[PDB]
Amino acid sequence: HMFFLNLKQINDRFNTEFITKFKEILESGWYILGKQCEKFENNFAKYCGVKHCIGVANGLDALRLIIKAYDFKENDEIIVPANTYIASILAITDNKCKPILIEPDINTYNINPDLIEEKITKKTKAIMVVHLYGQVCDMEKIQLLANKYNLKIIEDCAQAHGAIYKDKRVGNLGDAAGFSFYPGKNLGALGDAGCICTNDDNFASKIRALANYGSHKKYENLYTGLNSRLDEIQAAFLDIKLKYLDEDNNKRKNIANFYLQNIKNENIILPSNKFDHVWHLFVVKTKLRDELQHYLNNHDIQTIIHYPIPPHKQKCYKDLNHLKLPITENIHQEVLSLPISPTMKENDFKKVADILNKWKV
Amino acid sequence: HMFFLNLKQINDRFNTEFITKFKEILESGWYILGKQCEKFENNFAKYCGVKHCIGVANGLDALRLIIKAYDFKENDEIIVPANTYIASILAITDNKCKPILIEPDINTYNINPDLIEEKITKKTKAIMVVHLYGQVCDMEKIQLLANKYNLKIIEDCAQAHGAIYKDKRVGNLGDAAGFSFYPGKNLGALGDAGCICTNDDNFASKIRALANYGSHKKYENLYTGLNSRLDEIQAAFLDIKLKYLDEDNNKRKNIANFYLQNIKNENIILPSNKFDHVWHLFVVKTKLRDELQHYLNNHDIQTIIHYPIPPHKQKCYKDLNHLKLPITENIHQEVLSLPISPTMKENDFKKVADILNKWKV
Numbered sequence: 001h002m003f004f005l006n007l008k009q010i011n012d013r014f015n016t017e018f019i020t021k022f023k024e025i026l027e028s029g030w031y032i033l034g035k036q037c038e039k040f041e042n043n044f045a046k047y048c049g050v051k052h053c054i055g056v057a058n059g060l061d062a063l064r065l066i067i068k069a070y071d072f073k074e075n076d077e078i079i080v081p082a083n084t085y086i087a088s089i090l091a092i093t094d095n096k097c098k099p100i101l102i103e104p105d106i107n108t109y110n111i112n113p114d115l116i117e118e119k120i121t122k123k124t125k126a127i128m129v130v131h132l133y134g135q136v137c138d139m140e141k142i143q144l145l146a147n148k149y150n151l152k153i154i155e156d157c158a159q160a161h162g163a164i165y166k167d168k169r170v171g172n173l174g175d176a177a178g179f180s181f182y183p184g185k186n187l188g189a190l191g192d193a194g195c196i197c198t199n200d201d202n203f204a205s206k207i208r209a210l211a212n213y214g215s216h217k218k219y220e221n222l223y224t225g226l227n228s229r230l231d232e233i234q235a236a237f238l239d240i241k242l243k244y245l246d247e248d249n250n251k252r253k254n255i256a257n258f259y260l261q262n263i264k265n266e267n268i269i270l271p272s273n274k275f276d277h278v279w280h281l282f283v284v285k286t287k288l289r290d291e292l293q294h295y296l297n298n299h300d301i302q303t304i305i306h307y308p309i310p311p312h313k314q315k316c317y318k319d320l321n322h323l324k325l326p327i328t329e330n331i332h333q334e335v336l337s338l339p340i341s342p343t344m345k346e347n348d349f350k351k352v353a354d355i356l357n358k359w360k361v
Numbered sequence: 362h363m364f365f366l367n368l369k370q371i372n373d374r375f376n377t378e379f380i381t382k383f384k385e386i387l388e389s390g391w392y393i394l395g396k397q398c399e400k401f402e403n404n405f406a407k408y409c410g411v412k413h414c415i416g417v418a419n420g421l422d423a424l425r426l427i428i429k430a431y432d433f434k435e436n437d438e439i440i441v442p443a444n445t446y447i448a449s450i451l452a453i454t455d456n457k458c459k460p461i462l463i464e465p466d467i468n469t470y471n472i473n474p475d476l477i478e479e480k481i482t483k484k485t486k487a488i489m490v491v492h493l494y495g496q497v498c499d500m501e502k503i504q505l506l507a508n509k510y511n512l513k514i515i516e517d518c519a520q521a522h523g524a525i526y527k528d529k530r531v532g533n534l535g536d537a538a539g540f541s542f543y544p545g546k547n548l549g550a551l552g553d554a555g556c557i558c559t560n561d562d563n564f565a566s567k568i569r570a571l572a573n574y575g576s577h578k579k580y581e582n583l584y585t586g587l588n589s590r591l592d593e594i595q596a597a598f599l600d601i602k603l604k605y606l607d608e609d610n611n612k613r614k615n616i617a618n619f620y621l622q623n624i625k626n627e628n629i630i631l632p633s634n635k636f637d638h639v640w641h642l643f644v645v646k647t648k649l650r651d652e653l654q655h656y657l658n659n660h661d662i663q664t665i666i667h668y669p670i671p672p673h674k675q676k677c678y679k680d681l682n683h684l685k686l687p688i689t690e691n692i693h694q695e696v697l698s699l700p701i702s703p704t705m706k707e708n709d710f711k712k713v714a715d716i717l718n719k720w721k722v
């Protein structure tokens with residue numbers, strides 16, 4: 001059985017270092033807000049090319065905390081791609097802001113920048129761009145809109161660790177950026193973990209307070225905060241793995257290229273990489289998606305859908321269910337993710353392509 | 362230097378097991394919502410005598426999720442002790458409920474049950490009791506009150522793991538209970554961690570979904586949830602230490618009873634317990650508090666204040682600053698915690714007692 005994402009294969013590379021660092025932390029007696037956190041933050045900040053990184057508890061927390069720190073009014077509006085993972089939307093509604101859902105470009109699976117300005121109102125306060133599946137979104141027009149309309153740009157970078165746009169990295173393309181390090185993400189922890197990146201000194205400081213009980217100083221709560229922290233342990237495991245992230249992303253680039261050069265089936269629409277793509281998910285598109293997933297499972301190849309029900313169609317967002325978002329809807333009906341990971345074996349990726357080429361519907 | 366809480370000493374007893382279990386989890390390649398979480402939940406449920414235990418990310422989240430799951434209306438009231446740690450109140454306000462702050466009894470530091478009914482209104486939906494410092498609240502009148510008025514009882518158990526009121530454990534004295542397993546708590550993880558305990562089936566299922574993005578099934582989101590999970594690693598660590606928690610609590614009792622029996626100083630009010638007490642914190646009370654903390658520091662003993670500023674006097678809750686809560690206020694001016702731990706050395710507790718006895722002010 002070929003797994004969609006074999007985390008034991010990904011992480012076995014680092015077992016001895018993981019165990020050493022675990023023993024070190026034991027020796028230290030310090031498990032929360034310690035030297036591993038500081039060191040990982042400083043390294044990931046350098047990696048993204050930003051001044052400040054704040055470790056927090058997970059990627060949803062990361063986005064929720066960014067939005068919280070801005071102190072928007074209830075029902076203030078945040079423009080966001082309609083086809084992102086529901087956690088992007090959860091972060092907006094958690095803060096009692098209104099998600100304003102915008103269709104993706106079929107050629108990027110990212111928000112179509114050309115469709116944003118028409119949905120801007122007096123209540124719009126922010127654009128949340130999502131670098132979906134690993135590809136950076138085209139920022140040129142979004143930055144111009146944010147300047148014109150006094151909007152914040154919030155990046156959800158959970159699927160695109162390390163992706164590059166012009167001279168910069170995802171994480172450094174707007175005002176503040178949220179990352180997940182959920183274990184299955186391009187840089188994965190061994191438990192829940194996240195961070196926030198920004199260049200703004202005051203914002204950074206506010207976010208640190210907000211994620212630590214709203215406290216700058218022992219005893220004292222300046223803000224109504226959260227408990228959203230990155231464990232020393234997880235910070236340590238992340239910093240070991242961070243030294244290999246660009247290499248890991250390049251290994252995914254090699255697999256994606258093999259898929260793109262070798263899969264030739266009229267029933268399958270392959271993904272493109274207009275801008276830099278770190279290939280968190282390798283997403284194909286077909287009218288016979290359920291049939292493809294079943295066929296692949298018959299051939300011992302596990303595949304997962306990202307995603308089959310769009311946020312506006314979820315039961316939790318009943319008041320959005322009526323929205324007509326046909327591009328987003330069609331994508332959800334037709335997409336399927338092929339296995340891909342940095343450590344994936346050649347014989348496994350060749351088999352995936354060969355089996356897809358044999359699929360004759 | 363005598364540190365207030367020496368977590369290395371606490372945890373060193375378990376290092377070999379921690380490492381064994383970590384490797385086990387590495388072998389599993391499964392770090393989130395797995396067998397370790399299940400096992401620990403099952404065992405902590407048994408320990409509390411409840412049907413259900415849901416591991417979550419921390420004790421503040423535990424309380425926040427509980428209130429969220431009840432789906433109270435905006436500005437619905439939750440009665441809560443005024444002198445608790447601010448997390449208890451954050452859980453209430455994050456949910457857009459109004460906290461109704463009640464004075465503690467000066468001789469228990471817990472909510473005075475006799476002061477609750479007069480503050481019940483048509484908007485009251487719940488009573489949050491806190492078992493402060495490790496002492497269980499006198500629950501009988503509170504349970505009758507909540508029945509009389511159809512209120513939920515929410516227990517904040519973060520300081521009182523394993524305490525017993527009559528025939529039941531804390532965690533099994535209300536409708537739902539929150540626990541922290543912050544490393545410094547009586548059962549502490551090696552990272553942020555928490556749980557919810559309840560006997561109610563629907564409530565436990567609703568909580569699991571709410572803590573997993575609002576998802577009860579793959580691809581679907583029934584609620585607008587958040588991400589509050591207990592890592593497999595931390596669940597395994599906790600399960601190791603749980604097996605010693607009763608033994609350790611009894612060891613804390615021995616040391617607190619040493620303090621109570623051996624400290625005798627006219628400037629110091631000892632925390633004589635009215636009900637069962639597992640002595641998370643050993644809190645003394647004096648008119649010369651800052652002086653005492655300095656004296657002790659001069660004799661190389663570290664103390665911490667739990668707490669110096671009450672929630673209503675915090676900058677994050679300026680709308681509450683006006684409230685006249687003199688018992689709570691006095692307590693905050695006068696309390697100081699002495700070092701206590703189940704592993705604490707005899708010479709060390711004897712020195713604390715000795716140095717306090719010699720203290721003339």
Ligand SMILES: [Cl-]
Pocket residue numbers: 298
């Ligand atoms: Cl076949």
Ligand code: NA
Pocket residue numbers: 057191192193229231418552553554590592
């Ligand atoms: Na965590």
